[PDB]
Amino acid sequence: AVVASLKPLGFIASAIADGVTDTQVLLPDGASEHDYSLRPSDVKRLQGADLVVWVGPEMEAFMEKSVRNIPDNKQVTIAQLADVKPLLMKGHHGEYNMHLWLSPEIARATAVAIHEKLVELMPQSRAKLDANLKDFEAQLAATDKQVGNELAPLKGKGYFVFHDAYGYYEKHYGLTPLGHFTVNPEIQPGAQRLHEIRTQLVEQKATCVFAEPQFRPAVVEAVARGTSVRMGTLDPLGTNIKLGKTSYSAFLSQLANQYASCLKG
Ligand SMILES: [Zn+2]
């Protein structure tokens, strides 16, 4: 199997490995992209994998050690790919935005790297692997134009988010985010921070504020109450999307819909 750290990376791998080997994802729904704790069973999946796919030590810090052991011909570390380098953005600590799975260009570079490594590992399946990369690239191209069309009219419509995960997607599709607030998903912030957040929402004429799905509706409501800012939801991990050939395209289109549901009109 191909073992991917995060579900969207599993979407990309599942397109390339389709009909050749299974794809498996390590990180559950609602878990921390940085500080999840791998169980011994997860390390064992990793050590047993045909290929491991992850962003790198500045994102999934939780698997850095586990993956040290694994030879280069059996891992794709997306942040380290030569074709990804120039695409890495200043804009989770560290200096560079590591939410790489939301960049269509990096997703393509990721698919290419996975394909190259799988062809080297499984030359008996070269033609199937080639066909799969062909279909992934065709769908990504089609998706890119369609999403690009759907989001173009939303340019200049400002919004805020709670998790600054979206910068690659936003820059690529010309969305205009106003910034983000550090909010606890469980607890509505203290009066002073609630005041500063609400004044920024109003001061900048934000059309929307976008929560993540692990957010209690109450704390979102508290952030938005009495402002005229509409409430939306974004899922940067596509948790409701199943693995398979069309999954990464479905992910990009779903995110666009999620933006457009709130920002529209
Ligand atoms: Zn993040």
**CA-derived radius of gyration, the chain:** 19
Q: Which residues contact 136 (CB under 8 A, 6 or more apart)?
A: 12, 15, 16, 111, 245, 248
**Ligand 1 centroid – CA 92 distance (Å):** 6
**Ligand 1 centroid – CA 158 distance (Å):** 20
Residue listed under structure tokens 């999946």: 45
**Ligand 1 centroid – CA 153 distance (Å):** 27
**Ligand 1 centroid – CA 133 distance (Å):** 28
Sign of the Cα torsion 248, 159, 98, 213 reads negative
DSSP E strand boundaries for the chain: 2-4, 23-25, 51-54, 75-77, 159-161, 177-180, 208-211, 230-233
**Ligand 1 centroid – CA 20 distance (Å):** 31
Question: Which amino acid would we find at residue 227?
Answer: T
Distance CA 83, CA 65 (A): 25
Strands 159-161 and 75-77: unpaired
Which domains does the chain possess?
1-152 (3.40.50.1980), 153-265 (3.40.50.1980)
Name the packing angle between helices 7-17 and 247-263 (round to 10°): 140
10 closest CA partner among 213, 239, 256: 239
61 closest CA partner among 42, 28, 38, 30: 38
Is residue 206 a contact partner of residue 159, using CB atoms and an 8 Å limit?
yes
Reported as type and span, the H/E element at residue 167 is helix 167-173
- CA distances to 38, 46, 58, 60, 61 from 65, in Å: 11, 11, 13, 10, 8
**Ligand 1 centroid – CA 131 distance (Å):** 33
Distance CA 53, CA 147 (A): 26
Tokens for 238?
Answer: 């596509």
Q: Resolution of this entry in Å?
A: 1.9
Distance CA 38, CA 41 (A): 8
Distance CA 16, CA 135 (A): 9
Which of left, alpha, beta for 226 (phi over 0: left; psi -120 to 50: alpha)? left
**Ligand 1 centroid – CA 125 distance (Å):** 35
Question: Which amino acid would we find at residue 186?
Answer: E
